[PDB]
Design a protein around this nucleic acid. Structure first.
Ligand code: DZ4
Ligand code: MN
Ligand code: MN
Ligand code: NI
Length: 422
DNA sequence: GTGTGAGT
DNA sequence: CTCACACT
């Protein structure tokens, strides 16, 4: 149960090349063809953020210029993100995301984790399904696209063989058997994904396991329109060669410290250290967390749908682009406040609350820190012009140039945020 | 109130 | 870019 961290059934659903599929739903002509989506069109045709699987076979990857990508995929077609106030506009994608989320919310409550993925806690649905099943076996036909991680031992054929070996050894009578709960959870996810495709046409992948970390890791294991079930017994093999920085929450300084201090590279190697050793090197909390996590145990619950605590937006101006004149800072503050007003207005329309505070943050050229300073003021009226003047008033004192004709030092970031909701 | 980390 | 939270 809880001792072995097998108390819940959690799943993660992530859309395959989400932006590409959204383009395919609205503009048919790009469908079933190698394509990509670029961001900025003049420098080099734009950075690539979403690539179709057909094009991935040719070696094309994201974070590389469109013209440089045409090198190995001459058939490659390009689609562009609309631009607004100098930054990307994702309304189309966010609305499609909402569509999918609403369809998923029918089977169970979800936790939106990004623009194209969300976690689902199926524990209750699994109980209901185990009752309604009434002891009938689970045939492989109920899982047409499910992969069992770690099997077979000793491509569609491999999937079916692993599924047969998994199903033939499952407990039938012990209704609290972790493996049985996962199998039923995968059945429910098969239904959920079938419904999602039927009503929207989108394809996706999913991961099924006992916690968020394993569900996420499992989702990307068998990438396009496939789902992976990760049992507690399969964790050791899966972790044997799993990069530490690939585990949710260990991708930053903590993970790097673990690698550096213990001289290891893969998650599976942490199993050899004692809990006291992990606590003596990383602290009580991180030590216990690592000790349980390397054994497949994690407890963050899938928290329910929530109202945002803040609404904000920002923009970066690197190098040459650094804001030097007063006109520039005034104009960009105004642009930000107009986007803010648009969002605050929709927010107030949908949730009957008004933000009472405006937080202003900036970054000065030459400073390594994320923000040079942050200040706040009352946000009484949802008027972009007023907010722009208030933000300017708090940031104007910073200007060190007694000339008053320019900004010295320049600003490399502007951030506006509404909070203290009611 | 700052720092960290996930996800784009 | 956008956001949340743990710290403290
Ligand atoms: N750095 C970035 N900046 C802006 N948009 C981005 C971005 N990175 C990703 N996007 C957008 C591009 C993507 O369309 C969207 C989903 O991100 P994923 O789920 O991580 N990748 P995908 O869904 O494409 O495919 P797959 O399921 O095989 O992983 O995020
Ligand atoms: Mn995706
Ligand atoms: Mn994703
Ligand atoms: Ni004015």
């Amino acid at each position: 149960h809880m001792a072995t961290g097998q108390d819940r059934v959690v799943a993660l659903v992530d859309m395959d090349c989400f932006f590409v599929q959204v383009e395919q739903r609205q503009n048919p002509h790009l469908r079933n063809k190698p394509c990509a989506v670029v961001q900025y069109k003049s420098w080099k045709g734009g950075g690539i953020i979403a690539v179709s699987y057909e094009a991935r076979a040719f070696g094309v990857t994201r974070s590389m210029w469109a013209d440089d990508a045409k090198k190995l995929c001459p058939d490659l077609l390009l689609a562009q993100v609309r631009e607004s106030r100098g930054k990307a506009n994702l309304t189309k994608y966010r609305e499609a995301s909402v569509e999918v989320m609403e369809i998923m919310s029918r089977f169970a409550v979800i936790e939106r984790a990004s623009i194209d993925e969300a976690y689902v806690d199926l524990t209750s649905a699994v109980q209901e399904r185990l009752q309604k099943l009434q002891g009938q076996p689970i045939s492989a036909d109920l899982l047409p696209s499910t992969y069992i991680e770690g099997l077979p031992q000793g491509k569609e054929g491999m999937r079916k063989q692993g599924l047969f070996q998994w199903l033939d050894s499952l407990q039938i009578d012990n209704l609290t058997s972790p493996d049985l709960q996962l199998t039923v959870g995968a059945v429910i996810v098969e239904e959920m994904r079938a419904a999602i495709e039927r009503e929207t046409g989108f394809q996706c992948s999913a991961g099924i396991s006992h916690n968020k970390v394993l569900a996420k890791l499992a989702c990307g294991l068998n990438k396009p329109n496939r789902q992976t079930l990760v049992s507690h017994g399969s964790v050791p093999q899966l972790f044997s060669q799993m990069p530490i920085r690939k585990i949710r929450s260990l991708g930053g300084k903590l993970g790097a410290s673990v690698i550096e201090i213990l001289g290891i590279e893969y998650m599976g190697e942490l199993t050899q250290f004692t809990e006291s050793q992990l606590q003596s090197h990383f602290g009580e909390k991180n030590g216990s967390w690592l000790y349980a996590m390397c054994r497949g145990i994690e407890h963050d619950p899938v928290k329910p749908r929530q109202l945002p605590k803040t609404i904000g937006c920002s923009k970066n101006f690197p190098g040459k682009t650094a804001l030097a004149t007063r006109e520039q800072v005034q104009w960009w503050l105004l642009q930000l406040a107009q986007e803010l007003e648009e969002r605050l207005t929709k927010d107030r329309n949908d949730n009957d609350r008004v933000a009472t505070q405006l937080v202003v943050s900036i970054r000065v050229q030459g400073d390594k820190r994320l923000s040079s300073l942050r200040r706040c003021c009352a946000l009484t009226r949802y008027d972009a012009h007023k907010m722009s003047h208030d933000a300017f008033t708090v940031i104007k004192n910073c200007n060190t140039s007694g000339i008053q004709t320019e900004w010295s030092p320049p600003l490399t970031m502007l951030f506006l945020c509404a909070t203290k909701f009611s």
